[PDB]
């Protein structure tokens, strides 16, 4: 019992439940190759973590501002508000910082354990974990990287990715954020759906 996305359908051979969150869901045969699968598990993890952070920062501030604690703009507007620095300045800053961190992560994906150690201080390396979940300093509270815990992260990350898809499509066709959408729907549900939206 490795979980089944479609109860009556068997699971693919390349998927064997070894990876956390494996429910036998690959209809398009995207990972029939082992190296493709190894790359895609990392892709899913990083996309999902970014989506978690993203829709957290997209939605939680919105309800915080709509119950009268802070006053933040809408996510689809917050870029236009001007900050202490130019926007292009922030962009190139982020570009240089992200280029070094992503390159590091890439070098470990291609050859695991080759970039574990600090390049400046030759002590302070990382414990030999496994690609995708880099422990050590990236795990201060030192939680147990248990299999069930890894599955929870994969489960949440997929939900956050779908939530982000929903956020952007909702704002594109509706014209407002997520929380306004939800409260305006649950206000009068039978007359506030997509049908009335479209």
């Amino acid at each position: 019992k490795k979980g089944e996305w479609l109860p009556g359908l068997a699971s693919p051979g390349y998927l064997t439940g070894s990876l956390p969150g494996d429910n036998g869901f690959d209809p398009l045969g995207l990972a029939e190759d082992p190296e493709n699968l190894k790359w895609f598990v990392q892709a899913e993890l990083v996309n999902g973590r970014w989506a978690m952070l993203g829709v957290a920062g997209m939605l939680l501030p919105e309800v915080f501002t709509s119950i009268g604690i802070i006053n933040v703009p809408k996510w689809y507007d917050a870029g236009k508000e001007e900050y202490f620095a130019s926007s292009s300045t922030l962009f190139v800053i982020e570009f240089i910082l992200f280029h070094y961190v992503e390159i590091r992560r890439w070098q470990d994906i291609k050859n695991p354990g080759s970039v574990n150690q600090d390049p400046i201080f030759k002590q302070y390396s990382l414990p030999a974990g496994e690609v995708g979940y880099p422990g050590g300093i990236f795990n201060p509270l030192n939680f147990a990287p248990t299999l069930e815990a890894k599955e929870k992260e994969i489960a949440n990350g997929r939900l956050a990715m779908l939530a982000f898809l929903g956020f952007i499509i909702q704002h594109n066709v509706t014209g407002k954020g997520p929380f306004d959408n939800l409260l305006q729907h649950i206000s009068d549900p039978w007359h506030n759906t997509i049908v009335q939206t479209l």
């Binding site: 209809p27 398009l28 045969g29 995207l30 190759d33 493709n36």
Partner: protein
């Protein structure tokens, strides 16, 4: 503007063309009963013609000295709707088609009588394969990186 062309909405020849077009159809509507089938059909196409000219005006097309909406393909971002986004859509659809065909050819290449499955399509296998075209770009990228898209040995 670009290439000396002018925004059709503000051009005069573009309007003159619209009025002339609309004019001739109106003449065809006349000499028949005011609310007849043919007359109703002529009216329909008149409204359709007015909608097409207004749609052209709204989309911000470029009109020359003849008033015909010219298309810019240099890459100017004010004009990606004319060639480049339709081009990306086409490339997607054509890659879909070609990848599905190639997938099928590879899958049937292993039987003893492979020509039998070419003059007579295995439609169950084909329907199993058609929807991989949806992800064909990622699959083809990873196949090129793998080195299995292009046959070695040749």
């Amino acid at each position: 503007d670009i290439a000396g062309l002018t925004p059709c909405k503000d051009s005069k020849q573009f309007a003159k063309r619209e009025k002339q077009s609309i004019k001739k159809l109106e003449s065809s509507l006349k000499l028949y009963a005011p609310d007849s089938a043919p007359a109703l059909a002529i009216n329909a196409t008149i409204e359709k013609t007015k909608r097409r000219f207004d749609n052209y005006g709204k989309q911000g097309l470029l009109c020359g000295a003849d008033g015909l909406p010219h298309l810019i393909v240099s890459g100017d971002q004010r004009h990606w709707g004319e060639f480049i986004t339709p081009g990306i859509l086409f490339l997607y659809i054509a890659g879909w088609i070609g990848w599905v065909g190639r997938s099928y050819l590879i899958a049937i290449r292993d039987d003893k009588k492979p020509t039998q499955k070419e003059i007579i399509i295995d439609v169950p296998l084909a329907t199993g394969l058609v929807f991989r075209g949806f992800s064909w770009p990622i699959a083809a990228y990873r196949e090129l990186l793998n080195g299995e898209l292009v046959a070695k040995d040749v």
